[model samples]
Target: GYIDILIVSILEKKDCYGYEIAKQVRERSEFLKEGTMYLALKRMESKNLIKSYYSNEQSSGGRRKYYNLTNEGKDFLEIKKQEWRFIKKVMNQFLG
Candidate 1:
């Protein structure tokens, strides 16, 4: 349930490599799998919600790639947050 939130949070912080993203999610939530996270990231990238870059490295054999949220992602996350806030407010009105 919080996977999207975690992804948004991580993206907000900085561009990150795939393994690092999976590691961060695993640390924060037990419901995440490495493969699933990578798949989601790839899907998001496809949708233009995020973007990736390849950085050249002398020590490494090939280019090291990293992902970052697109402006679209930030906007989407903000919309999701507002919806959650509205739902929370309505739920509290009933529960309170």
Candidate 2:
């Protein structure tokens, strides 16, 4: 879930391509898988959390998709943040 949050948080600032998104995710998190990350991309796009713009200009490597967050995504991000706080607070009762 942090991956999804990390993604929306990144897009909240600016647009990004798949690899760039993955690179940032890697820097923030411990691990990621190629297939898994792309699947999240596709899932988010389909869910209207993110929109992809295709480039016909073919700047590099045939084609690349640039993604940005949708309004719904911003709301969802807020929800995730709340959930994260709740989870941390609840878990700390046991873990702490």
Candidate 3:
């Protein structure tokens, strides 16, 4: 559910290819694999939350599919950020 938020957060900085996204996600947490990342991206693309394009840069003779967040995605990210902040406050209250 929140993978969309995580992926979009990265894209907020700059557009990224699938592998780069996978790398960043792995650096943050082991929740996403390359296949899963691409699958999530495809779903978000279908929903108009994100969009992808073939970049002019090539790696290993193949063009990279770079992804960026749409306006809807930015709005969604704001909502998710608020959700996270609320969750954090609640969890902290439980910490004693």
Candidate 1 runs further than 4 Å off: 59-62, 92-96
lDDT of 2 by residue, 1-96 (tens): 457777898898888888888898888778788788788888898999999997667566567789989999999989988998999998999999
Task: Give each model's whole-structure lDDT.
Answer: 0.79, 0.85, 0.84
Best by lDDT: 2
The TM-scores, one per candidate, come to: 0.77, 0.84, 0.85
What does candidate 3's lDDT look like per residue over 36-76, in tens digits? 77788999999989988885555663787888899999998
Task: Name every residue pair that clashes in candidate 2.
Answer: none
Question: Per-residue lDDT for 78 in model 2?
Answer: 92
The alpha-carbon deviation from the true structure for residue 24 of candidate 2, after best TM-score superposition, in angstroms, is 0.9
RMSD of each: 2.7, 2.1, 2.2
Clashing pairs in 3: none
lDDT of 1 by residue, 1-96 (tens): 466667877888788887777888777766677777777777788888889988777646456778888899999889888999999999999998
RMSD of 3: 2.2
